[PDB]
Write a protein that binds this ligand. Sequence first.
Ligand code: RET
Ligand code: RET
Lengths: 61, 61, 220, 220
Amino acid sequence: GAVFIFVGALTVLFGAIAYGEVTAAAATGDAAAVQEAAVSAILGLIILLGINLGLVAATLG
Amino acid sequence: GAVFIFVGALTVLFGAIAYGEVTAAAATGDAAAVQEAAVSAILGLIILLGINLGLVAATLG
Amino acid sequence: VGLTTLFWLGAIGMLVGTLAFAWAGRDAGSGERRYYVTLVGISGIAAVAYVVMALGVGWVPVAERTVFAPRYINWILTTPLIVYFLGLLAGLDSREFGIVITLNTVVMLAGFAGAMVPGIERYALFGMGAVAFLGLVYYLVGPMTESASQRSSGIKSLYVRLRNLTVILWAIYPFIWLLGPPGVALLTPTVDVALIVYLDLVTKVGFGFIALDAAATLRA
Amino acid sequence: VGLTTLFWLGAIGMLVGTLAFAWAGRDAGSGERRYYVTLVGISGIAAVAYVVMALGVGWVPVAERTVFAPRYINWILTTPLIVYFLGLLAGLDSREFGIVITLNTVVMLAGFAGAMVPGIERYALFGMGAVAFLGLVYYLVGPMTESASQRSSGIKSLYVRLRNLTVILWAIYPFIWLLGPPGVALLTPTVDVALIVYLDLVTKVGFGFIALDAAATLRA
Ligand SMILES: *C/C=C(C)/C=C/C=C(C)/C=C/C1=C(C)CCCC1(C)C
Ligand SMILES: *C/C=C(C)/C=C/C=C(C)/C=C/C1=C(C)CCCC1(C)C
């Protein structure tokens, strides 16, 4: 039951990291750079879902 | 056990939607617009994790 | 994808649920029929609401955003049916049922009114919806769980599983209200619409499938 | 956050595991000690590798990207210890253990060599790593699961749980290789590093905690 708070909190931490790269890229005015950072954020968050689900399935399945 | 393929496939579908908004915003050269689309993608993907976990916990917990 | 594409996807997913629930229902007894009929109303009403939005109706401008009236109207109509389904499982009394349906309706009405208010006072209406929702969760996990614990093991087990699905996923909707167009508009209209389609589908159709799968195991 | 901040977080998480595993280990019998020592080596080695990267050492330029030598070197050293831990649980034979450690090592060596190759032929090396990994998964879910099924219920239960954690999460690493700097570089260096820190921590420290929690329940 705590595994869910570990996963939920790690996800926000990862989100904050991804958000930082988007805003940093934004600060340049280079649209392509923000896109690059955003594509990385999206793939990373999808991968993160797999990791969290794997962890959850593995411990509670 | 299939619930995991429902969740995994829905996540990629959602990712593709978010990716489309990022590339569309990118096509404008407006960095702030890509940032806007990317921030939405990140929050949306975090929320999506909650939904998927809720579904998984609820059916297999 | 556009908004209307997503609305069409919502409508179709709801139709699939409705068809599945109607057909699973040809196999039911006197005491069972009400469950299948309730699932048909829930998904059937949501299916029509999604057609309405897909057809471009009820897109209400509020300041610089768009709130979907049929979104909230169909919640108002269908969430009491979901609470009814749960209360039937729990074996709820006439009076206590009135209490949960009231709390439920306050949530849905407050959120609809809030989405409609351009000014900052929409957050007070949200706040009232949120407090009512906490009261709703209390009944679901407290009194209603106590009632359900007195029923057969198969019924108790389905109640807890649908209760957990309901409590966890319903808790997500207010965050989408706050982050989406009704609140601070950090979610694009499209992402907002996609999340609600998904959530609507799981809380109605997923909920229904879970019920279908347990009902089959019990009678047979 | 920067790369070095993430490396420091990796090092600290691994240290926390190592400390927890060492201390949990003061309570163990002759036949138990090897499990705790193995967990200490796994997390202890990874802790040092993360310090090395955090201190800016082993950042190897390969074309226009940076591959972290200590990443792959510490996998090479620690993954065989993880397979060893699993094989002890499964009750594996001398010969079959040699087979899984070999397959494991081929995966890690191929991925390290591939990360080092600037040209397109790095994907052939990846491919060889991937085929070996499928062979590894086969032993884990086939022969090794068959062996484990002959042990006490508590041991069988821990093996299956650690096996599932291992099979699912290890399967994610190659996708990160393909999408990150070693492959098509769609993940930024930072995101790549964050995902691997998380994954390393779960497959070592999470794995260990799961084992600690079951071991306590069994002996006592
Ligand atoms: C089929 C539709 C479902 C299950 C809709 C559920 C919607 C809610 C639980 C909404 C909750 C809200 C709050 C708790 C606060 C006020 C805003 C709302 C209406 C979005
Ligand atoms: C503590 C470290 C762990 C558990 C590292 C696990 C790493 C892997 C399972 C890597 C797998 C790879 C492939 C299957 C294909 C080739 C590329 C690799 C080395 C990333």
